[PDB]
Amino acid sequence: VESFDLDHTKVKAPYVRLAGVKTTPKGDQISKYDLRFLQPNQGAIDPAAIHTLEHLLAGYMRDHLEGVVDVSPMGCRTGMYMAVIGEPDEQGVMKAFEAALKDTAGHDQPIPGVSELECGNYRDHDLAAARQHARDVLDQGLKVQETILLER
Ligand SMILES: [Zn+2]
C-alpha cells in the first residue's frame, strides 16, 4: 500500500496519481504522488531541465498546497515525485500542480537557488526547457490517473 504496483504501459500522461500512502506511528498519512509529465518510455526530460523543474516546483507547489514534504525528480525523468502529509486528495493535488505549472511556464525571472552556495550542480540548469515542459503539460491537459496494477 506504500507503493502501488503500477502497470506503466496503461497510463495516459500527463497526469496526477496517488502512488501510495504510508501511515505514521501516530496515525497521520503521508500521501505519495506521481506527477507525470511524459508518457513512460516515450521520451525523457533532459537532466538540466528536470533539475530546474525541481528548483521551481519546490516553491510553486508549496504556494498552492499545504503539507508538502518535498518535490523530487523521478529517476526515470518522465515526471516528479512528491510526498504530502495528509489524506489522499488527488483532485486537490491536481489543481495545485496545475497552478504551479502556470507559475512555472510564466517564470521569466532567474532560477532560484542557483549558485555554488545553494546548489550541488549549479551549472546544470535550463529555464527555457523547464518552462516549455510546463507549457506542454497544460496544453495537453491533466487528469487524475487511476492506478492500473500489474496482474503478476
Ligand atoms: Zn540544484
Q: Which amino acid, residue 150?
A: L
* Contact partners, residue 6, CB within 8 Å, separation at least 6: 19, 34, 147, 148, 149, 150
Q: What spacing in Å lies between the alpha carbon of 35 and ligand 1's midpoint?
A: 19
Method used for this model? X-ray
Q: What spacing in Å lies between the alpha carbon of 49 and ligand 1's midpoint?
A: 11
Residue 119, annotated as binding a ligand: yes
Q: What spacing in Å lies between the alpha carbon of 120 and ligand 1's midpoint?
A: 6
Could you tell me the three cell numbers for 151? 496482474
Q: What spacing in Å lies between the alpha carbon of 58 and ligand 1's midpoint?
A: 11
Q: What spacing in Å lies between the alpha carbon of 99 and ligand 1's midpoint?
A: 22
Q: What spacing in Å lies between the alpha carbon of 4 and ligand 1's midpoint?
A: 29
Q: What spacing in Å lies between the alpha carbon of 10 and ligand 1's midpoint?
A: 32
Residue 76, annotated as binding a ligand: no
Please report the DSSP string for the chain in residue order: --S--B-TTS--SSEEEEEEEEE-TTS-EEEEEEEE-S-TTS----HHHHHHHHHHHHHHHHHH-SSEEEEEE-TTSSEEEEEEESS--HHHHHHHHHHHHHHHHT--SPPTT-STTT-TTTT---HHHHHHHHHHHHHH---BPPP-B---
Q: What spacing in Å lies between the alpha carbon of 16 and ligand 1's midpoint?
A: 24
- For the structural domain made of 1-152, what CATH number should be given? 3.30.1360.80
